[PDB]
Amino acid sequence: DRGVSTFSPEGRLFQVEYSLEAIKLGSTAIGIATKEGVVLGVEKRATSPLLESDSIEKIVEIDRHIGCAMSGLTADARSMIEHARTAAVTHNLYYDEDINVESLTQSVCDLALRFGEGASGEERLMSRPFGVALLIAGHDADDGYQLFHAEPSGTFYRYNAKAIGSGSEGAQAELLNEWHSSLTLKEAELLVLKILKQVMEEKLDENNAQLSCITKQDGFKIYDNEKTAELIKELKEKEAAES
Amino acid sequence: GSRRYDSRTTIFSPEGRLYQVEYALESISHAGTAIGIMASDGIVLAAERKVTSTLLEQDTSTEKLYKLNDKIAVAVAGLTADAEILINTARIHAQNYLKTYNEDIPVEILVRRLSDIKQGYTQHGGLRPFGVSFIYAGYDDRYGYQLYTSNPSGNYTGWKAISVGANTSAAQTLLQMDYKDDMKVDDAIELALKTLSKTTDSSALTYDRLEFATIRKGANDGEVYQKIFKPQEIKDILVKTGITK
Amino acid sequence: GYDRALSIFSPDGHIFQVEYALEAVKRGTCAVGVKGKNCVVLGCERRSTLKLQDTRITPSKVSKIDSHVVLSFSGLNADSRILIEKARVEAQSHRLTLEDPVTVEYLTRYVAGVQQRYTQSGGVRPFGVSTLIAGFDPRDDEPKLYQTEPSGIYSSWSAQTIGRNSKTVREFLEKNYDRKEPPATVEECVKLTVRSLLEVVQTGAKNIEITVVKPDSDIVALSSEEINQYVTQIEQEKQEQQ
Amino acid sequence: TTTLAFRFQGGIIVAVDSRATAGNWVASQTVKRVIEINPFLLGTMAGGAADCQFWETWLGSQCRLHELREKERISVAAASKILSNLVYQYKGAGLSMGTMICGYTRKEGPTIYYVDSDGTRLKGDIFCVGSGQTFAYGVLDSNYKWDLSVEDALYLGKRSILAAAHRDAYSGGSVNLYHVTEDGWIYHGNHDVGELFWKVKEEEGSFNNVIG
Amino acid sequence: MTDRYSFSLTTFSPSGKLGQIDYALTAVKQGVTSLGIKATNGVVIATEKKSSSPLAMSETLSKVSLLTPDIGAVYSGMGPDYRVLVDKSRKVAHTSYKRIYGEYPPTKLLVSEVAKIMQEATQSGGVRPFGVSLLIAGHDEFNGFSLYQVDPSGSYFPWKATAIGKGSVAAKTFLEKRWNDELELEDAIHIALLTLKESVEGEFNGDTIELAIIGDENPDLLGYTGIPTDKGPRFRKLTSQEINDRLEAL
Amino acid sequence: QFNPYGDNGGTILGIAGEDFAVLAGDTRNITDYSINSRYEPKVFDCGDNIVMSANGFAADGDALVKRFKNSVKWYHFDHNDKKLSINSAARNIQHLLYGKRFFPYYVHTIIAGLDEDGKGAVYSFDPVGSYEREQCRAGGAAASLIMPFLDNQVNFKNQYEPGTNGKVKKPLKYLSVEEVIKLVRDSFTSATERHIQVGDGLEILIVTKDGVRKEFYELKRD
Amino acid sequence: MDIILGIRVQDSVILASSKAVTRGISVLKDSDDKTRQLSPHTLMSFAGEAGDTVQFAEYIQANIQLYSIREDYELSPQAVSSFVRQELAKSIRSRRPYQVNVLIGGYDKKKNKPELYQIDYLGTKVELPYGAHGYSGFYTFSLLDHHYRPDMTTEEGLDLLKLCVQELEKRMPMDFKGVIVKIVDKDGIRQVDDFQAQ
Amino acid sequence: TQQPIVTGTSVISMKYDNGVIIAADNLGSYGSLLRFNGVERLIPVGDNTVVGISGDISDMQHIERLLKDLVTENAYDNPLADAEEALEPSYIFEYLATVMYQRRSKMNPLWNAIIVAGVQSNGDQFLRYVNLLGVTYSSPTLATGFGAHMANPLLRKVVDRESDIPKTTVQVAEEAIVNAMRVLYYRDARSSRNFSLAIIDKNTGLTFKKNLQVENMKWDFAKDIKGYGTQKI
Numbered sequence A: 001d002r003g004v005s006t007f008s009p010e011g012r013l014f015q016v017e018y019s020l021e022a023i024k025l026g027s028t029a030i031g032i033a034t035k036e037g038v039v040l041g042v043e044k045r046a047t048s049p050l051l052e053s054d055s056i057e058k059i060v061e062i063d064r065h066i067g068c069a070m071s072g073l074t075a076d077a078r079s080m081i082e083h084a085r086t087a088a089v090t091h092n093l094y095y096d097e098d099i100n101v102e103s104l105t106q107s108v109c110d111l112a113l114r115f116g117e118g119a120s121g122e123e124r125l126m127s128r129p130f131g132v133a134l135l136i137a138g139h140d141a142d143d144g145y146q147l148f149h150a151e152p153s154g155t156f157y158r159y160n161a162k163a164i165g166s167g168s169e170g171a172q173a174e175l176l177n178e179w180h181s182s183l184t185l186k187e188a189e190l191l192v193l194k195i196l197k198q199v200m201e202e203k204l205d206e207n208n209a210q211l212s213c214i215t216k217q218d219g220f221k222i223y224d225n226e227k228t229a230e231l232i233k234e235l236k237e238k239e240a241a242e243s
Numbered sequence B: 001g002s003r004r005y006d007s008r009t010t011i012f013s014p015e016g017r018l019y020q021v022e023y024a025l026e027s028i029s030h031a032g033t034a035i036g037i038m039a040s041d042g043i044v045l046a047a048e049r050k051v052t053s054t055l056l057e058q059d060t061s062t063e064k065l066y067k068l069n070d071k072i073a074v075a076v077a078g079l080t081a082d083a084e085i086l087i088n089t090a091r092i093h094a095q096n097y098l099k100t101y102n103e104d105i106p107v108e109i110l111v112r113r114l115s116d117i118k119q120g121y122t123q124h125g126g127l128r129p130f131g132v133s134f135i136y137a138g139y140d141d142r143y144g145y146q147l148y149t150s151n152p153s154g155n156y157t158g159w160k161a162i163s164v165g166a167n168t169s170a171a172q173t174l175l176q177m178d179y180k181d182d183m184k185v186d187d188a189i190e191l192a193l194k195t196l197s198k199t200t201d202s203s204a205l206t207y208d209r210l211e212f213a214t215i216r217k218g219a220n221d222g223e224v225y226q227k228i229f230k231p232q233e234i235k236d237i238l239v240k241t242g243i244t245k
Numbered sequence C: 001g002y003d004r005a006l007s008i009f010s011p012d013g014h015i016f017q018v019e020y021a022l023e024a025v026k027r028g029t030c031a032v033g034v035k036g037k038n039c040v041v042l043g044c045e046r047r048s049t050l051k052l053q054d055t056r057i058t059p060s061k062v063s064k065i066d067s068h069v070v071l072s073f074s075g076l077n078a079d080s081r082i083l084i085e086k087a088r089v090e091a092q093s094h095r096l097t098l099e100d101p102v103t104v105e106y107l108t109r110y111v112a113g114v115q116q117r118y119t120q121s122g123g124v125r126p127f128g129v130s131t132l133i134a135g136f137d138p139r140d141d142e143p144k145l146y147q148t149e150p151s152g153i154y155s156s157w158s159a160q161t162i163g164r165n166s167k168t169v170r171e172f173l174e175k176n177y178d179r180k181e182p183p184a185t186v187e188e189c190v191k192l193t194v195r196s197l198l199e200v201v202q203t204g205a206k207n208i209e210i211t212v213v214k215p216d217s218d219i220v221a222l223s224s225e226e227i228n229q230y231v232t233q234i235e236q237e238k239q240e241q242q
Numbered sequence D: 001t002t003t004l005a006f007r008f009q010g011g012i013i014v015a016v017d018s019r020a021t022a023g024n025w026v027a028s029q030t031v032k033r034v035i036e037i038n039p040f041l042l043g044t045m046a047g048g049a050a051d052c053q054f055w056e057t058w059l060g061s062q063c064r065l066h067e068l069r070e071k072e073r074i075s076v077a078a079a080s081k082i083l084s085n086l087v088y089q090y091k092g093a094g095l096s097m098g099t100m101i102c103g104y105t106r107k108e109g110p111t112i113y114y115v116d117s118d119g120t121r122l123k124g125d126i127f128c129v130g131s132g133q134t135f136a137y138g139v140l141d142s143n144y145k146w147d148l149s150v151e152d153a154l155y156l157g158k159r160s161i162l163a164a165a166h167r168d169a170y171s172g173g174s175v176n177l178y179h180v181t182e183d184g185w186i187y188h189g190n191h192d193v194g195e196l197f198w199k200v201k202e203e204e205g206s207f208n209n210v211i212g
Numbered sequence E: 001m002t003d004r005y006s007f008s009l010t011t012f013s014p015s016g017k018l019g020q021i022d023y024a025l026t027a028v029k030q031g032v033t034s035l036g037i038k039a040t041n042g043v044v045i046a047t048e049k050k051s052s053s054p055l056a057m058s059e060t061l062s063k064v065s066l067l068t069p070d071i072g073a074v075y076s077g078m079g080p081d082y083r084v085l086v087d088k089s090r091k092v093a094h095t096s097y098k099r100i101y102g103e104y105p106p107t108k109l110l111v112s113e114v115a116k117i118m119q120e121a122t123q124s125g126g127v128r129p130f131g132v133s134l135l136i137a138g139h140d141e142f143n144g145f146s147l148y149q150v151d152p153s154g155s156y157f158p159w160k161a162t163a164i165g166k167g168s169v170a171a172k173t174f175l176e177k178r179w180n181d182e183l184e185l186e187d188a189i190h191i192a193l194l195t196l197k198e199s200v201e202g203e204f205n206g207d208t209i210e211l212a213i214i215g216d217e218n219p220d221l222l223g224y225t226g227i228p229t230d231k232g233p234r235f236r237k238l239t240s241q242e243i244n245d246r247l248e249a250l
Numbered sequence F: 001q002f003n004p005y006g007d008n009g010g011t012i013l014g015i016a017g018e019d020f021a022v023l024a025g026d027t028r029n030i031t032d033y034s035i036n037s038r039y040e041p042k043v044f045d046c047g048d049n050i051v052m053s054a055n056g057f058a059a060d061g062d063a064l065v066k067r068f069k070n071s072v073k074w075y076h077f078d079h080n081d082k083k084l085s086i087n088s089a090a091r092n093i094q095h096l097l098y099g100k101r102f103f104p105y106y107v108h109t110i111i112a113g114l115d116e117d118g119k120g121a122v123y124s125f126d127p128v129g130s131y132e133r134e135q136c137r138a139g140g141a142a143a144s145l146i147m148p149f150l151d152n153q154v155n156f157k158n159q160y161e162p163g164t165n166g167k168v169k170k171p172l173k174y175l176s177v178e179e180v181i182k183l184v185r186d187s188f189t190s191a192t193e194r195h196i197q198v199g200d201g202l203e204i205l206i207v208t209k210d211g212v213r214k215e216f217y218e219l220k221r222d
Numbered sequence G: 001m002d003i004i005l006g007i008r009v010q011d012s013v014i015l016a017s018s019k020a021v022t023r024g025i026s027v028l029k030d031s032d033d034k035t036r037q038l039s040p041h042t043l044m045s046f047a048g049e050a051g052d053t054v055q056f057a058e059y060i061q062a063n064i065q066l067y068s069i070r071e072d073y074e075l076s077p078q079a080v081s082s083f084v085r086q087e088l089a090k091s092i093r094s095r096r097p098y099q100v101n102v103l104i105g106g107y108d109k110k111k112n113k114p115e116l117y118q119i120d121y122l123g124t125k126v127e128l129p130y131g132a133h134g135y136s137g138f139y140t141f142s143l144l145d146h147h148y149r150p151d152m153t154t155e156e157g158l159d160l161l162k163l164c165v166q167e168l169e170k171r172m173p174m175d176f177k178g179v180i181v182k183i184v185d186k187d188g189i190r191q192v193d194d195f196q197a198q
Numbered sequence H: 001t002q003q004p005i006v007t008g009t010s011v012i013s014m015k016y017d018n019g020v021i022i023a024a025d026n027l028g029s030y031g032s033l034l035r036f037n038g039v040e041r042l043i044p045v046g047d048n049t050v051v052g053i054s055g056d057i058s059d060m061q062h063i064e065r066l067l068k069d070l071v072t073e074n075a076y077d078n079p080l081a082d083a084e085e086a087l088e089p090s091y092i093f094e095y096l097a098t099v100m101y102q103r104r105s106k107m108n109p110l111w112n113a114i115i116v117a118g119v120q121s122n123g124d125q126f127l128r129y130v131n132l133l134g135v136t137y138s139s140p141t142l143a144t145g146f147g148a149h150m151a152n153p154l155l156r157k158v159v160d161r162e163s164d165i166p167k168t169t170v171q172v173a174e175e176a177i178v179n180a181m182r183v184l185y186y187r188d189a190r191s192s193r194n195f196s197l198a199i200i201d202k203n204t205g206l207t208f209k210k211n212l213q214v215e216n217m218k219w220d221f222a223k224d225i226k227g228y229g230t231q232k233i
Helices: A016-022 A075-093 A101-109 A168-176 A185-199 A225-239 B018-028 B080-101 B107-123 B166-180 B185-197 B231-241 C017-026 C075-099 C104-120 C167-173 C187-200 C224-237 D047-070 D076-089 D133-142 D152-168 D193-203 E019-030 E079-096 E106-123 E168-178 E187-200 E240-248 F056-077 F086-099 F142-152 F176-195 G050-071 G077-091 G136-147 G156-169 H059-073 H087-106 H147-152 H170-187 H221-222
Strands: A028-031 A037-043 A058-062 A066-072 A132-140 A144-150 A158-161 A161-164 A209-215 A221-224 B035-038 B042-048 B065-067 B073-077 B133-137 B145-150 B156-159 B161-164 B210-216 B226-227 C031-035 C038-045 C064-065 C068-076 C130-137 C143-148 C152-158 C159-163 C208-214 C220-223 D001-007 D011-018 D020-023 D025-028 D034-038 D041-044 D098-105 D109-116 D121-123 D126-131 D173-181 D182-194 E032-037 E043-048 E065-068 E070-079 E132-140 E143-148 E156-159 E161-166 E208-214 E235-237 F011-016 F021-026 F029-031 F034-036 F044-047 F051-055 F107-114 F119-124 F129-134 F136-140 F201-208 F211-218 G004-008 G013-017 G019-025 G026-029 G033-039 G042-048 G100-106 G113-119 G126-128 G181-184 G189-191 H010-017 H017-025 H028-029 H033-037 H043-044 H050-056 H112-117 H127-132 H136-138 H141-143 H196-199 H206-213
Touching: A016 A066, A016 A132, A016 B185, A016 B231, A028 A066, A028 A132, A028 A144, A028 A168, A028 A185, A028 C064, A037 A066, A037 A132, A037 A144, A037 A185, A058 A075, A058 A221, A058 D126, A066 A075, A066 A209, A075 A101, A075 A132, A075 C104, A075 D047, A101 A132, A101 A144, A101 A158, A101 C152, A101 D173, A101 E168, A132 A161, A132 A209, A132 A221, A144 A161, A144 G050, A158 A161, A158 G189, A161 A168, A161 E161, A168 A185, A185 A225, A185 E208, A209 A225, A221 A225, A225 C152, B018 D109, B035 B073, B035 B133, B035 B145, B035 B185, B035 G019, B042 B073, B042 B145, B042 B161, B042 B185, B065 B226, B073 B210, B080 E106, B080 E156, B080 G077, B107 B133, B107 B145, B107 B156, B107 C075, B133 B161, B145 B161, B145 C017, B161 B166, B166 B185, B185 B231, B210 B231, B231 C104, B231 D152, C017 C068, C017 C130, C017 E043, C031 C068, C031 C130, C031 C152, C031 C187, C038 C130, C038 C187, C064 C075, C064 C130, C064 E032, C064 G050, C068 C075, C068 C104, C075 C104, C075 D076, C075 F107, C075 G050, C104 C130, C104 C152, C130 C159, C130 F029, C159 C167, C167 C187, C187 C208, C187 C224, C187 D182, C187 F176, D001 D098, D001 D109, D001 D133, D001 D152, D011 D041, D011 D109, D011 D152, D020 G156, D025 F142, D025 H206, D034 D047, D034 D182, D041 D047, D041 D126, D047 D076, D047 D098, D047 F129, D076 D098, D076 D109, D076 G019, D098 D126, D098 D173, D109 D126, D126 D133, D133 D152, D133 G019, D133 G026, D152 D173, D152 D193, D182 D193, D193 H147, E019 E070, E019 E132, E019 G013, E032 E070, E032 E132, E032 E168, E043 E132, E043 G004, E065 E079, E070 E079, E070 E208, E079 E106, E079 E132, E106 E132, E106 E143, E132 E161, E132 E208, E143 E161, E161 E168, E187 E208, E187 E240, F011 F051, F011 F107, F011 F142, F021 F051, F021 F107, F021 F119, F021 F176, F029 F211, F034 H136, F044 F056, F051 F056, F051 F136, F056 F086, F056 F107, F056 H087, F056 H136, F086 F107, F086 F119, F086 F129, F086 G136, F107 F136, F136 F142, F136 H127, F142 F176, F176 F201, F176 F211, G004 G042, G004 G100, G004 G113, G004 G136, G004 G156, G013 G100, G013 G113, G033 G050, G042 G050, G042 G077, G042 G181, G050 G100, G077 G100, G077 G113, G077 G126, G100 G181, G156 G181, H010 H050, H010 H112, H010 H147, H010 H170, H017 H043, H017 H050, H017 H112, H017 H127, H017 H170, H043 H196, H043 H206, H050 H059, H050 H087, H050 H196, H059 H087, H059 H112, H087 H112, H087 H127, H127 H141, H147 H170, H170 H196
Parallel strands: none
Antiparallel strands: A028 A037, A028 A161, A037 A209, A058 A066, A066 A132, A132 A144, A144 A158, A209 A221, B035 B042, B035 B161, B042 B210, B065 B073, B073 B133, B133 B145, B145 B156, B210 B226, C031 C038, C031 C159, C038 C208, C064 C068, C068 C130, C130 C143, C143 C152, C208 C220, D001 D011, D001 D126, D011 D173, D020 D025, D034 D041, D041 D098, D098 D109, D109 D121, D173 D182, E032 E043, E032 E161, E043 E208, E065 E070, E070 E132, E132 E143, E143 E156, E208 E235, F011 F021, F011 F136, F021 F201, F029 F034, F044 F051, F051 F107, F107 F119, F119 F129, F201 F211, G004 G013, G013 G181, G019 G026, G033 G042, G042 G100, G100 G113, G113 G126, G181 G189, H010 H017, H010 H141, H017 H196, H028 H033, H043 H050, H050 H112, H112 H127, H127 H136, H196 H206
16 A cells, blocks of 8 residues: 555655644644643534434543543544553552553553554554544643643643644634633633634534543543533623623 | 555445455356245255266266255355355354254354355455355244355345346246245246246256256155255156256 | 555545445445434334345344344445444443443444454454444433444434435434424334335335334334334325325 | 451441461551452452452452443442452462452442352352351341441441450451441441450350350 | 565456466466376376486376375376475375275365365465366275366366367367277277377377376285285376387277 | 572561651571671662562562562653652562462561651561551561560550559650660660571661661671 | 252252351351353253352353344253253363253243253263252152152142252251252243242 | 482682682582593683582583673673673673573572672672572672581681771682682592682782692591501401
């Protein structure tokens, strides 16, 4: 088919480049890490009376202190989660404590390398690389609240805020202006809603958005439909009184 | 390695097809004919051996009739070779059901397995599939007489009259008309032979260009006794219908 | 070794093989599921054109995955056996190990998971089948309806329709259902299901097979006799709205 | 070792010994005997110590993994049946286990399953398990009453342990009490056998109607 | 490192054909005129002996191999494919039958065992399929004397006379006309030399025909001169002088 | 035929105190009546305020330790030089111990140090698995002799002040580093007399948040 | 072991199975039953080693239950007994057999005949009108043969079984404290609550 | 498993200030038959380590090969290597021990007991013991076989603490080794009259005197003749 070991004159593999193309087509995932929490928000999107829109969400829990929101292909993010749960569970049994979000990303990225015909270095069992990129957010007692962007290529960077998805070009640009080093959890969540409203071609409801948060008295916690909607209710009125 | 020294024909197509499967059915449509008429006191089976000679034996009249059991047999349309691997393995799949539960396999289970092995050859491995279509002539006490066909794609359908091989089209157009919904063996035999002559070009219909088997209840033979007609019993039935012309 | 590639990227960030899997489903027969708030109805085509089929040993479109759970499909039968078998095993695996009746969400994750594997993993291609999975969770009276694609993705849907003329049947259904007032009685939800599936089968009232699932293993397949009666009625309704 | 559990109106009373010895002189009154599975599930150490230590922590991990996977609370039943499958494979090569998996779930109530090295799985309502079982059950039985409040319930659990501790040389350093409630388990302290003996002798009049 | 070849090298073409089987058959048509006759009082098979060189032994050369004791085979096609195939056929025939049922496989059963080898090889990649066709002529005491054809794919069909190689059809015409069952083995040898003289011109001898029969017994083919216990071989290959003697016999 | 398993004697003593903890061990190494060593550190610093001694049979000690030394290294690499907790290290050992039991182990392992919330901690292990936390633990061959004193004077168990000795008692005071060392020298000096498995030298590693501090007191030599 | 009796009467197939676990003087548990429904008219009762029991029992149950959903068809009691036997006869070679003796009590809804199967741990399956395992049969076969001969009802079986159990607890020194009895017939499976003279 | 049929006995050692001394008979026993007299059982591994091996010869032959492969593999990666990353006493000993432990742990054991003596060229003296039971220890005096019993109490009077090591000289050291070995031949007859003895110097590298023979003969037994063949009828 297409080479699995054949590089560009620069030296960037075809398969890596193609990995970058599926990512850009999902719905935005935006994280801001603050000093009291990590906020992860997604656009879930789609509203139909023939659709159960509040039974599907893109914010899935890995552990009692770790979530991930995704953007790109969703089917691919299931294999990534199966590997990640197994690795975290086995480490909690051996040393009784939290696994590091950076550590997790490296363990996963190792199995992202298989695709194609095998090597004599590695047994390549898959056919393509993963076509989803992830924002993995967590807490550890030795670096507090953190936010991480794993690319399926191998690179994983720590960030204080980062957006991924289709609408990331705008989103990131807004994140910087709104970002400061005295930002808190409660402000950050309101701001998320501002960003989400702006870039929508619709009215922001909780059957097209979902919030989530991290506090260290409860771990990774999903901001529920009932609370997320109350936050949406408060937004619409206050915005619509600045006009 | 093998990437640029091989190709991939086991992939899908821009219609949703698989190259080799669609093609496999074509191979079958120019192979020799197999016909299945299910009656309600029997099963009548007819097959045309396309081209026969006095240099071939015509004496072997198991050439496309194989018993897989004393209760299930198939009629083959396609290659002997392709046929051989699924027969031998089907007979083995039988013995396993028989050992485990002390009772013979229903027809339906055995078909579903067969089809899964055939799907398997295009589904993984890169391999090629078989190029032979089977007509299942079979029994249950849940379903009476049973008549199936299964294909290299692995789809399988229930019948009470079916054909695969060449001239499929001609046999089935006469058959649907002249069918009687519940009928005896002897009536079936008259109907079959009548259909058969007029699907075989010019004067050619002979006993020794035919393979015939009927599966009757009997009362000097046991319940579901398969009689695979050897030349001489074909000669008789042709003269009785008078259809030898 | 046949663990090497057989599924590759698109430059558009799709996958060629998943786009081609969906086409086989469309050419295919049509399956539909419409929800009340007491039942979940599944309609499945049996459009026997030819009369030489014997139809008690002609394959059905309804499988038990579990005693309170059904799977229906549109797509190649050959591929669908392979998926259907793995899904029955998984219901029994939970039953054995957790000492607990099966929950619908986990099964859906399982059905999704084998198809997802075969796109990702090398020297295998995805199945030629889209499915609908429905049933009821234990000690629960609210309906559950899931859709899975051979991409391996999965969703819940209040109602969904698949195979040939999916557009036509969605579009119709959308005018006859609200989540705020879905049907309470079996008769009228079934009337609606038979009417949508009439409009695409062409002639059919023995060629349409309805199976209505009420809570916890009350699963009953309505018959030809009954269906012919609803079609008569529909021919009376269409000259009361003229 | 004499380790017990009963289901009663208030929940479950889990009563246990702790005792480690160098000879027969009780070196320390503290040994592990309760393995903490999860915040609402207890499993007892006894039998193969090592087998219990490894596999009940393991069990705790797999349970935590179910709560991610399926988003459901585990049964005591689901917990036991996993343990048993693994136990039977390593049999005939070693592996010894003596545990009772005790919990109070909202989806079953107070629930007790007994699990042994051979792979039996048994549900009951009253257990004593041990080698002091028969005597301990006697004490338990004659003052048993499902309806009863937590305070009395605890003192009875404790008296069965002392009764057992006295005849047998495999218990009695101090007595550890646990009440497994709906919302998780509550420790009720370590009772010195030395202070406890003198109280019980006068009080119960059981094997002691005329003191002996 | 090492092979990874598991993709089938035999694949379907737009017509329903199999490229490799089509190719292989061209080779077979171009191969050495071989025939088989059932005389009814025996079976006689003849094939062309050839020499590479006059200074070359043709004792070593293999154009007629005994697959099992009462059974011989001859071919048209590709010589190297033939040699290996004979070997796998001999091996399974000996291990799986000769003290299991206590005797050789029946002819039809042995034709199926060959058929399977060729079909494994056609299905599976790493290797191309066999390029051969055989005429397996035989005797088994539960089916009499038989003649089969084994095709390159492993399709087989029963025959009572045939010829394959170059110049088949006309060879069958002469054989069809001269023999119609119930015929001495000797007479079938005579007919066979006549069919082949008309078929091969340029130079013809019995030193360029290699002839085997299954259709005799000697005490020497029980393999002992004592007191019988079993029947033993009936394969006998003739020497060149005996064949010239039958060429002299009108 | 063959079973390498025997004994090699030696004696270790772990005491958890108020902010600190000790792992005291003699430095005599034996096999029967012969002297293998008259100095050989029998308390060893594995790093991270964790000091460790596998008393019993030597052959298993060396193995247990090597498996564990490579785990200390791998924990650091894979988790960016995040230091190993006494409790976590104890779990890691449990899994090691439990990993061989088809070839069974005959050691009494004891670890001492500080936990990360700042309380002295000593954990004692059973030879094929298990650990539990104890306040005080005497270990090794002469465990049985040391513990009955220790229980009175540190732990204030089977100790009561002359009165009624039953509602009057002597109470629990967490000892000082000086007062602990006196005790430990006294135990060991009595021990040398009575055991040929104790003598030669006494190495006390005292473990504090100022590091690991070494003390050396002399003992009897034949 | 565990005293498990079965008697096949005219109208139904009666299996009797021990009801209590005795520790010393007193019954710690007396709410025992050990039987598993295989299908609504195939029942298996169990006796042997108590951990070999649950491990086999759920293994066999799982396989037959996978066949039931798959085919959407109920299997015969004959079908199950051949299946149970084969599986025993694989394990008896292996180095950790089950040591479980079973009775499977079934009404063959497809013959319309009653059937009783007694299967040894070895794999010895025998169809009988009455049977017993071990030392039980010495006291109870001597009554069963004399006082009972084939072609006797449900009511008659109940009284017969009581007599048997009373002699076993007196005269045979094994103690298992009576049986609670179940009937497998055409209309499925009921537990006969009474045990006063039935 | 295995139990002995072929024995070698006795390799003795000590530290002095600026080296070590090791001495060993040269022996392949078949019980009490001195079958092979002259078998190497000080194996110089480089010029700064000597490996003494006692116990089963069948096992000794296998290690003898393994050490000669270690030299060949120590010339790999740079040919002038001898303190760069190869050829130090600690390396040769750790290597032997990893094999020793593995074999016993699976119970098909190496039935030897080893003394590695050398002087590091980067550091000070090296002296460490390993046996078939997986017990390993270090001390300023060490002996295997008979010599553990009998020679080692003689050794301990000179050195047995760290402090006594600077106070022993080459002469004092050599006198203890020459005394000890005379004792070994006198009370145990397995030990061959020929021995080889090596002194491993910081000052002058490796001095190995091979095929040296016990001298300063005892004929003390002659005093105690009360006859044993001297017959008068």
